Assembly symmetry: C2
């Protein structure tokens, strides 16, 4: 199966895509969608009513949904389990066709819709929605389809008089998919990739991405996904976790989110290990405290633009966002001056009404409060100085200005802890301490997700690459630490950053299949004795 990456559109004035997106945005203005839980084809409402708010205008309730209770979740499990055998017995190609059709729909007639719902519901600007809800999701669907179809061609050796064949079975049981607010595409992949491999899934989408998540769900159903293969089950986090880890039929958890939550689920599975019919597979992509490391030979313009984008795009709400910048003293006057000047030109505002907006409000009240706590810490710490930004205002939306901080302490808590907000901390190191500082990049935090080195000196790049081998699972030379592209930079890292199953690459789907090998022998067997025994 031949596939290539979905083009990223330019959205120039008067372009078809810009016109379509403007209309789709208008289609959502003032609208609230009532989004039910979906079990099979049944739309189910509980009394546990919840609302998703537009981050940049929280008066706008973009969706009303509800939390599935334990009983509803248990029903969803039973219904899914009953549909699994037939789905798993379907040829891989037939299952792939659903995702390829969904991809075509997202590429064309549904593009504007999913972009708009991601913009209005999650607070993304045009381009951030485009690389996510369109390109990345489309790529996940097309590339995983290719990988899965080609996996069936990975067959063992047959020697006469026997024929051997590997059957890539889905896992027996159900998979729980738990997706984060920050990428529409990640939800699609967490539920979609296991389903592609013959699994059935309870999908708990993020509250704060409900609108776009349901849009993806409906597209999958319209593209031909049968009932009870993916159940759409928003729920209270703990309740969902407690329920799925209590079922003897749990066979996997596909998680993206916080370290402590993933650890909790892992421990719940371990506590209940004697109840399960098989050993559940846990996949978890968690956060990072990602670096941009600058050598004195760096191209300053690239450092500045790459760092502004990595640190501040989508309000810094990326697992891969740069939050610690290491700069040699010799380059600091240039980089400081340029960062502060460009900072003053960044527009924070309504991304639907003003396409000039660089980034918008953070996701919700809780994120706003957490980020404010870090800004307050930056105003308190003896080693920290806010160079620019630091303002926030939640009267209309959850607006946090981009903030640039200098730390005199390379080990300050702000250098170690993931904020998930538009907060960049800079540490200036003496040029003659480059090596010691590279070691600090590696040793300071608990994370291992992304990092970049900016340098134009080959020996330096080779040395830094070797030294930072385990400091970053996605490592960048002269580029920003965010924006991995499916099939080009498979994404993930180790240390505390998760299990590193590399979604976006060819091996990810292997976590969602439990292979069976069939040997058929075409001639009757001989005696049980062996010739040497005579």
């Amino acid at each position: 199966l031949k596939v290539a990456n979905e083009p990223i559109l330019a959205f120039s004035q008067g372009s078809p895509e810009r016109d379509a997106l403007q209309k789709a945005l208008k289609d959502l203005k003032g609208q609230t969608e009532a989004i039910p839980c979906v079990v099979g084809d049944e739309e189910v409402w509980t009394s546990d009513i919840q609302y998703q708010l537009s981050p940049f205008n929280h008066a706008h309730k973009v969706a009303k949904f509800c939390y599935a209770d334990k009983a509803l979740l248990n029903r969803a499990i039973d219904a899914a389990l009953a549909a699994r055998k037939e789905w798993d017995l379907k040829p891989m190609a037939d299952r792939a066709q659903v995702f390829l059709k969904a991809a075509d729909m997202l590429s064309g007639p549904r593009r504007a819709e999913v972009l708009a719902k991601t913009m209005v519901g999650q607070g993304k600007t045009v381009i951030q929605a485009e690389i996510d809800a369109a390109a990345e999701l489309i790529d996940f669907f097309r590339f995983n389809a290719k990988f899965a179809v080609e996996l069936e061609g990975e067959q063992p050796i047959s020697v006469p008089p026997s024929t051997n064949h590997t059957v890539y079975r889905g896992l027996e049981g159900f998979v729980a998919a738990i997706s984060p607010f920050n990428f529409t595409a990640i939800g699609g992949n967490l539920a979609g990739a296991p389903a592609l491999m013959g699994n059935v899934v309870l999908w708990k989408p993020s509250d704060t991405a409900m609108l776009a998540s349901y849009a993806v769900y409906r597209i999958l159903r319209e593209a031909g996904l049968p009932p009870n293969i993916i159940q759409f089950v928003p729920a209270d986090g703990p309740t969902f976790g407690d329920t799925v880890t209590s079922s003897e039929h749990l066979c996997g958890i596909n998680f993206t989110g916080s370290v402590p939550t993933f650890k909790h689920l892992w421990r719940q599975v371990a506590q209940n290990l004697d109840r399960f019919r098989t050993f559940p597979r846990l996949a978890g992509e968690c956060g990072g405290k990602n670096f941009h490391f600058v050598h004195s030979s760096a191209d300053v313009d690239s450092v500045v633009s790459g760092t502004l984008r990595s640190a501040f795009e989508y309000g810094g709400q990326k697992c891969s966002a740069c939050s610690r910048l290491y700069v040699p003293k010799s380059l600091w006057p240039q980089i400081k001056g340029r960062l502060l000047e460009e900072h003053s030109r960044i527009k924070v505002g309504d991304p639907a009404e003003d396409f000039g907006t660089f980034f918008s409000a953070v996701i919700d009240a809780k994120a706003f409060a957490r980020i404010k706590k870090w800004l307050e810490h930056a105003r308190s710490s003896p080693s920290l100085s806010i160079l620019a930004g630091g303002q926030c205002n939640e009267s209309v939306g959850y607006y946090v200005e981009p903030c640039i901080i200098e730390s005199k302490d390379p080990q300050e808590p702000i250098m170690k802890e993931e904020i998930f907000g538009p907060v960049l901390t800079v540490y200036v190191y003496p040029d003659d301490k480059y090596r010691e500082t590279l070691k600090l990049v590696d040793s300071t935090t608990s994370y291992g997700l992304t990092g970049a080195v900016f340098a134009q000196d080959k020996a330096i790049v080779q040395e830094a690459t070797r030294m930072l081998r385990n400091a970053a699972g996605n490592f960048y030379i002269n580029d920003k630490s965010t924006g991995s592209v499916v099939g080009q930079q498979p994404f993930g890292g180790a240390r505390a950053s998760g299990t590193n199953d590399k979604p976006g690459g060819p091996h990810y789907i292997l976590r969602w299949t439990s292979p069976q090998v069939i040997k058929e022998t075409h001639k009757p067997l001989g005696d049980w004795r062996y010739s040497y025994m005579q």
Copy 2:
């Protein structure tokens, strides 16, 4: 381009040929000599950390299963201090080993494979026969063929994996580095296959990991032989630490280290679950999330349809149930037979049964299988034989005796159950004990469901049938009852590269050692993107 990437190589390997050991053959003469080399000998096997041979006070003996007066090895359990010293030294060796080209790491295993194939073949076979109680052919498919195949095929899979690279588009170049896991891996191997110990420790090492290998007490002699061959083949010090130990003690120590990054386990389900829980308990101490791999037991079936070839059923079932005393994770322990064929099959099984020779595999090559592994195994099997006599649902059709005066000798035993849910149909015995359930022909479908639902396991199984429609139906119905499924062949004897081995349900994590994907559990890939042009502005054109 500041980073330059090498062309990846390819590797041509094929399965190691099984030798015939005919009279007057060089391999038979060599094996006889190697067996004589062991007669009356006790090897003192130390712990090895780096290149240092270390002894502790916890002295242990390995006995020859068929002559337990013969202590084939004296070894010792590493204490917690020594295990922690081994961890420290392995960790200090890891970065250099991980940075070695995959092809250089592969060379060690290819050299070891050649040594095992040729000059060391008789040695590892003899040590497996004498120490684990295997017959010639069981040792051959194991200590030679399978171990050699693991080393060669995994080397091929690993070298070729580096050719799996992502797409690059201007202005950037993307490359995947297949890093070893950061930390150490604990490998915990079982008594029943010499080859499994080699794979459990060796596969992670091949992928740039460092390993503490706790071999099975009852396979110490052969295991140390493999370890020595690896070192001789060029494995550097501190890459695989040879550390026999008390099982609980070993598990407590490795799961208490912040640097644990994997456990590669084959053995009992309860032990695997215990380790899994210990890792979960210590989750907050680890630098990264440890990867647990576990292959555990089965309760494997041969299912017979009325259309089956009777002779194939009988011979395949006798081998599956009784070879190596049924001490295989894949051994047939439940036989389902249709009433129409039971008179023929029963007659044949009983006749052939009476011809099975149990005895000393070193002294008498006529031996079909020998003693079970140890006193513990003997005791357990004895209790099951007693259960068969006591249970009103069970009847012993053949065998049923045992004698531990010289070796742990158990006759092959065939039992009929009238109850398809009898405990003996559910619980793994790991002994030469076959249970048969006879079902009415017209209930074959209902009976297929019973095959699927009766046990907690999903490892191996076979269907014997000449009807295509039936084979297709059974194959669909039994999809999750067996990770290795056989049509008209016995349920044991998977061959590397041909039948990748493993199963789910209670039988383990099913990572399919023997196949091309197993090595992926032991690498944590990094992707490097190098961009070759300056970046532009931070703004985008649509924002204008």
